[PDB]
Amino acid sequence: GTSMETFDPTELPELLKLYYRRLFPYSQYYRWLNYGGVIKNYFQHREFSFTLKDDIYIRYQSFNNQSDLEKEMQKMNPYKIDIGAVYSHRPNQHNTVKLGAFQAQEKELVFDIDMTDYDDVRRCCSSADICPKCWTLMTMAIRIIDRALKEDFGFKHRLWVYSGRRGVHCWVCDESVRKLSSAVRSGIVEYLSLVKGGQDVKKKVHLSEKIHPFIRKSINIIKKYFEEYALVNQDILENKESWDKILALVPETIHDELQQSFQKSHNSLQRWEHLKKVASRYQNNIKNDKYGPWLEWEIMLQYCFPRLDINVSKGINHLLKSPFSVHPKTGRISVPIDLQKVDQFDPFTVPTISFICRELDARDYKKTSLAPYVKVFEHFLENLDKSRK
Ligand SMILES: [Zn+2]
């Protein structure tokens, strides 16, 4: 695959200047972080962090209103913009605050799903690269996590954003969610988590006998993709070097039976069908006479289910890349992802700052390929607006 790295980043300053002057959607961005103006000082107490040239960054930047933010962004033309928590005081006054009183109080619940966490189950790309094959992992992650957040937790205001390179972020923005404690956020991650363990750990998925609906519904999403993704594109049972990795996920007592059936068959599709049958006949507990799909599902989960960094989601003060910021090393915009078109999302066609600046002079983002992504954002804002009395 490819890491999408910009070959010549010396173009970035003049492109950023144009982007921040004419294309960055300031009015919509402020409408987001002002949250209807119904909490006093909510925008003014938000931390922003700007990264400049040479990875030099400034923390605890804050702004009075939309005009202020516009002017500072156009003055500093940052390479990166990170959004942090809403604080007890204006961040840009935190040094006037007596020690201990400056506290992060609220922030969106965020997830950060990164392709490198799947390195142990990708056959297509080296660690730093992505390709059209492994991007399906992100498609599944979005569907699995968005459905749970929406249906199981009742979170209504969920913004999925491209990372600009190798992953996706989710911003959960409900007012009740912004107030949740670190402990509660950790509990949400634990509910959503099924793949656990480092490279130290060979088998990373262990299912209980009793199936919770979250596991069933997640498996059912994976099943829509698994044949094309895992058996065709990844070809996970192509040969012994690869199918041995799967046998390491199932009891040793069925390896020989599976080894021999893998050698008699000719493709990953056939070999998966044998695995499902042998697995469904394994007696997990010599006591009872109960059989089922747990091994099959554990394999599918280990290969297809997202890995969730609990630190990202539990920290109230965590800085995360801003929607509509520019990835300095790829040029790609951190665009919102239309959930209704998740299967059509291609990171390789996400607008770059170079591309949309060329479109601009050939007035407004509506003249450019950024426009449909602003409309996705606007729908998210409309749903937030509808929720307020
Ligand atoms: Zn790949």
Coordinates of all heavy atoms in Angstrom, one line a residue, residues 114-158:
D114 N -7.2 3.4 14.3 CA -6.0 3.6 13.6 C -5.6 2.3 12.9 O -5.5 1.2 13.6 CB -4.9 4.1 14.5 CG -3.6 4.5 13.8 OD1 -2.9 3.6 13.3 OD2 -3.3 5.7 13.8
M115 N -5.2 2.3 11.7 CA -4.9 1.1 10.9 C -3.8 0.3 11.5 O -3.8 -1.0 11.4 CB -4.7 1.4 9.5 CG -4.7 0.2 8.6 SD -6.4 -0.4 8.4 CE -7.0 0.8 7.2
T116 N -2.8 0.9 12.1 CA -1.7 0.2 12.6 C -2.1 -0.8 13.7 O -1.3 -1.8 14.0 CB -0.6 1.1 13.2 OG1 -1.0 1.8 14.3 CG2 -0.2 2.1 12.1
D117 N -3.2 -0.6 14.5 CA -3.6 -1.5 15.5 C -4.1 -2.8 14.9 O -4.3 -3.8 15.6 CB -4.7 -0.9 16.3 CG -4.3 0.3 17.1 OD1 -3.1 0.3 17.5 OD2 -5.1 1.2 17.4
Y118 N -4.2 -2.9 13.6 CA -4.6 -4.2 12.9 C -3.4 -4.8 12.2 O -3.6 -5.7 11.3 CB -5.6 -3.9 11.8 CG -7.0 -3.3 12.2 CD1 -7.2 -2.0 12.1 CD2 -8.0 -4.1 12.6 CE1 -8.4 -1.4 12.5 CE2 -9.2 -3.6 13.0 CZ -9.4 -2.2 12.9 OH -10.6 -1.7 13.2
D119 N -2.2 -4.4 12.5 CA -1.0 -4.9 11.8 C -0.9 -6.5 11.8 O -0.4 -7.1 10.9 CB 0.3 -4.3 12.3 CG 0.5 -2.9 11.8 OD1 -0.1 -2.5 10.8 OD2 1.3 -2.2 12.4
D120 N -1.4 -7.1 12.9 CA -1.3 -8.5 13.2 C -2.3 -9.3 12.3 O -2.3 -10.5 12.4 CB -1.6 -8.8 14.7 CG -2.8 -8.0 15.2 OD1 -2.9 -6.8 14.9 OD2 -3.6 -8.6 16.0
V121 N -3.2 -8.6 11.6 CA -4.2 -9.3 10.8 C -4.3 -8.7 9.4 O -5.3 -9.0 8.7 CB -5.6 -9.3 11.5 CG1 -5.5 -10.1 12.8 CG2 -6.1 -7.9 11.7
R122 N -3.4 -7.9 9.0 CA -3.3 -7.4 7.6 C -2.2 -8.1 6.8 O -1.1 -8.3 7.3 CB -3.1 -5.9 7.6 CG -4.2 -5.1 8.0 CD -4.0 -3.6 7.6 NE -2.8 -3.0 8.2 CZ -2.2 -2.0 7.8 NH1 -2.5 -1.4 6.6 NH2 -1.1 -1.5 8.4
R123 N -2.6 -8.7 5.7 CA -1.6 -9.3 4.8 C -1.3 -8.4 3.6 O -0.3 -8.7 2.8 CB -2.2 -10.6 4.3 CG -2.4 -11.6 5.4 CD -2.7 -13.0 4.8 NE -1.6 -13.6 4.1 CZ -1.6 -14.0 2.9 NH1 -2.7 -13.9 2.1 NH2 -0.5 -14.5 2.3
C124 N -1.9 -7.3 3.4 CA -1.8 -6.5 2.2 C -0.7 -5.4 2.3 O 0.0 -5.2 1.4 CB -3.2 -5.8 2.0 SG -3.9 -5.0 3.5
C125 N -0.6 -4.7 3.5 CA 0.2 -3.5 3.6 C 1.2 -3.7 4.8 O 0.9 -4.3 5.8 CB -0.7 -2.3 3.9 SG -1.7 -1.8 2.6
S126 N 2.3 -3.0 4.6 CA 3.2 -2.8 5.7 C 2.6 -1.8 6.7 O 1.6 -1.2 6.4 CB 4.6 -2.2 5.2 OG 5.1 -3.0 4.2
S127 N 3.2 -1.8 7.9 CA 2.5 -1.1 9.1 C 2.0 0.3 8.7 O 0.9 0.6 9.1 CB 3.5 -1.1 10.2 OG 2.9 -0.4 11.3
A128 N 2.9 1.1 8.1 CA 2.6 2.5 7.9 C 1.7 2.8 6.7 O 1.3 3.9 6.5 CB 3.9 3.3 7.7
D129 N 1.3 1.8 5.9 CA 0.6 1.9 4.7 C -0.9 1.5 4.8 O -1.3 0.8 5.7 CB 1.3 1.1 3.6 CG 2.7 1.5 3.3 OD1 3.0 2.7 3.5 OD2 3.5 0.6 2.8
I130 N -1.7 2.0 3.9 CA -3.0 1.5 3.7 C -3.3 1.3 2.2 O -2.6 1.7 1.3 CB -4.1 2.5 4.3 CG1 -4.1 3.8 3.5 CG2 -3.8 2.8 5.7 CD1 -5.3 4.7 3.7
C131 N -4.4 0.6 2.0 CA -4.8 0.3 0.6 C -6.3 0.0 0.6 O -7.0 0.0 1.6 CB -4.1 -1.0 0.1 SG -4.7 -2.5 0.7
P132 N -6.9 -0.1 -0.6 CA -8.4 -0.3 -0.7 C -8.8 -1.6 0.0 O -10.0 -1.7 0.4 CB -8.7 -0.4 -2.2 CG -7.6 0.5 -2.8 CD -6.3 0.1 -2.0
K133 N -8.0 -2.6 0.2 CA -8.3 -3.8 0.9 C -8.5 -3.5 2.4 O -9.6 -3.7 3.0 CB -7.3 -4.9 0.8 CG -7.1 -5.4 -0.6 CD -6.1 -6.5 -0.6 CE -5.9 -7.2 -2.0 NZ -5.0 -8.4 -1.9
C134 N -7.5 -3.0 3.1 CA -7.6 -2.9 4.5 C -8.5 -1.7 4.9 O -8.9 -1.6 6.1 CB -6.2 -2.8 5.2 SG -5.0 -1.6 4.4
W135 N -8.8 -0.8 4.0 CA -9.8 0.3 4.4 C -11.1 -0.3 4.8 O -11.8 0.3 5.6 CB -10.0 1.3 3.3 CG -10.7 2.5 3.9 CD1 -12.0 2.7 3.7 CD2 -10.2 3.4 4.8 NE1 -12.4 3.8 4.5 CE2 -11.3 4.2 5.2 CE3 -9.0 3.7 5.3 CZ2 -11.2 5.3 6.1 CZ3 -8.8 4.7 6.2 CH2 -9.9 5.5 6.6
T136 N -11.5 -1.5 4.3 CA -12.7 -2.1 4.8 C -12.7 -2.3 6.3 O -13.8 -2.4 6.9 CB -12.9 -3.5 4.1 OG1 -12.6 -3.4 2.7 CG2 -14.3 -4.0 4.2
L137 N -11.6 -2.5 6.9 CA -11.6 -2.5 8.4 C -12.2 -1.3 9.0 O -12.9 -1.4 10.0 CB -10.1 -2.7 8.9 CG -9.5 -4.0 8.6 CD1 -8.0 -4.0 8.9 CD2 -10.1 -5.2 9.3
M138 N -11.9 -0.1 8.4 CA -12.5 1.1 8.9 C -14.0 1.2 8.7 O -14.7 1.7 9.5 CB -11.7 2.3 8.3 CG -10.3 2.4 8.6 SD -10.1 2.8 10.4 CE -8.4 2.3 10.6
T139 N -14.4 0.7 7.5 CA -15.8 0.7 7.2 C -16.6 -0.2 8.3 O -17.6 0.2 8.8 CB -16.1 0.1 5.8 OG1 -15.3 0.9 4.9 CG2 -17.5 0.1 5.4
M140 N -16.0 -1.4 8.6 CA -16.7 -2.2 9.6 C -16.6 -1.5 10.9 O -17.6 -1.6 11.7 CB -16.0 -3.6 9.6 CG -16.3 -4.4 8.4 SD -15.6 -6.1 8.4 CE -13.9 -5.7 8.2
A141 N -15.5 -0.9 11.3 CA -15.4 -0.2 12.6 C -16.4 0.8 12.8 O -17.1 0.9 13.8 CB -14.0 0.4 12.8
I142 N -16.6 1.7 11.7 CA -17.6 2.7 11.8 C -19.0 2.1 12.0 O -19.8 2.5 12.9 CB -17.6 3.6 10.5 CG1 -16.3 4.4 10.4 CG2 -18.8 4.6 10.5 CD1 -16.1 5.0 9.0
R143 N -19.4 1.1 11.2 CA -20.7 0.5 11.3 C -20.9 -0.1 12.7 O -21.9 0.1 13.3 CB -20.9 -0.5 10.2 CG -21.1 0.2 8.8 CD -21.5 -0.8 7.7 NE -22.7 -1.5 8.0 CZ -23.9 -1.0 7.6 NH1 -24.0 0.2 7.1 NH2 -25.0 -1.7 7.9
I144 N -19.9 -0.8 13.2 CA -20.0 -1.6 14.5 C -20.1 -0.6 15.6 O -21.0 -0.7 16.5 CB -18.8 -2.5 14.7 CG1 -18.8 -3.7 13.7 CG2 -18.6 -2.9 16.1 CD1 -17.5 -4.4 13.6
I145 N -19.3 0.4 15.6 CA -19.3 1.3 16.8 C -20.4 2.4 16.7 O -21.0 2.7 17.7 CB -17.9 2.0 16.9 CG1 -16.8 1.0 17.2 CG2 -17.9 3.1 18.0 CD1 -16.9 0.3 18.5
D146 N -20.7 2.9 15.5 CA -21.8 3.8 15.4 C -23.1 3.2 15.8 O -23.9 3.8 16.5 CB -21.9 4.4 14.0 CG -22.8 5.6 14.0 OD1 -22.4 6.6 14.6 OD2 -24.0 5.6 13.5
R147 N -23.4 1.9 15.3 CA -24.7 1.3 15.7 C -24.8 1.1 17.2 O -25.9 1.4 17.8 CB -24.7 -0.1 15.0 CG -26.1 -0.8 15.3 CD -26.0 -2.3 15.5 NE -25.2 -2.7 16.6 CZ -25.5 -2.6 17.9 NH1 -26.7 -2.1 18.2 NH2 -24.6 -2.9 18.8
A148 N -23.7 0.7 17.9 CA -23.8 0.6 19.3 C -24.0 1.9 20.0 O -24.9 2.0 20.9 CB -22.5 -0.1 19.8
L149 N -23.3 2.9 19.6 CA -23.4 4.2 20.2 C -24.9 4.7 20.0 O -25.5 5.2 21.0 CB -22.4 5.2 19.6 CG -21.0 4.9 19.9 CD1 -20.1 5.9 19.1 CD2 -20.6 5.0 21.4
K150 N -25.4 4.6 18.8 CA -26.7 5.0 18.5 C -27.8 4.2 19.2 O -28.6 4.8 20.0 CB -26.9 5.0 17.0 CG -28.3 5.4 16.5 CD -28.6 4.9 15.1 CE -29.9 5.3 14.6 NZ -30.2 4.7 13.2
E151 N -27.7 2.9 19.0 CA -28.9 2.1 19.5 C -28.7 1.6 20.9 O -29.7 1.7 21.7 CB -28.9 0.8 18.6 CG -29.3 1.1 17.1 CD -29.5 -0.2 16.3 OE1 -29.1 -1.3 16.8 OE2 -30.0 0.0 15.2
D152 N -27.5 1.2 21.3 CA -27.4 0.6 22.7 C -27.3 1.7 23.7 O -27.8 1.5 24.9 CB -26.1 -0.3 22.7 CG -26.2 -1.4 21.7 OD1 -27.2 -1.5 21.0 OD2 -25.2 -2.1 21.6
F153 N -26.7 2.8 23.4 CA -26.5 3.9 24.4 C -27.4 5.1 24.2 O -27.5 5.9 25.0 CB -25.0 4.4 24.3 CG -24.1 3.4 24.9 CD1 -23.3 2.5 24.1 CD2 -23.8 3.3 26.3 CE1 -22.5 1.6 24.7 CE2 -23.0 2.4 26.8 CZ -22.3 1.5 26.0
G154 N -28.1 5.2 23.0 CA -29.0 6.3 22.7 C -28.3 7.6 22.5 O -28.9 8.6 22.7
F155 N -27.0 7.6 22.0 CA -26.3 8.8 21.7 C -26.8 9.2 20.3 O -26.7 8.5 19.4 CB -24.8 8.6 21.7 CG -24.3 8.1 23.1 CD1 -23.1 7.4 23.1 CD2 -25.0 8.4 24.3 CE1 -22.6 7.0 24.3 CE2 -24.4 8.0 25.4 CZ -23.3 7.3 25.5
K156 N -27.2 10.5 20.2 CA -27.9 11.0 19.0 C -27.0 11.8 18.1 O -27.3 12.0 17.0 CB -29.1 11.9 19.4 CG -30.2 11.1 20.2 CD -31.4 12.0 20.4 CE -32.5 11.3 21.0 NZ -33.7 12.1 21.1
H157 N -25.9 12.3 18.6 CA -25.1 13.3 17.9 C -23.6 12.8 17.7 O -22.8 13.0 18.6 CB -25.1 14.6 18.6 CG -26.5 15.1 18.9 ND1 -27.4 15.4 18.0 CD2 -27.2 15.1 20.1 CE1 -28.6 15.8 18.6 NE2 -28.5 15.5 19.9
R158 N -23.4 12.1 16.6 CA -22.2 11.4 16.4 C -21.6 11.8 15.1 O -22.2 11.7 14.1 CB -22.4 9.9 16.4 CG -23.3 9.4 17.6 CD -23.8 8.0 17.5 NE -24.4 7.7 16.2 CZ -25.6 8.0 15.7 NH1 -26.5 8.6 16.5 NH2 -25.9 7.6 14.5

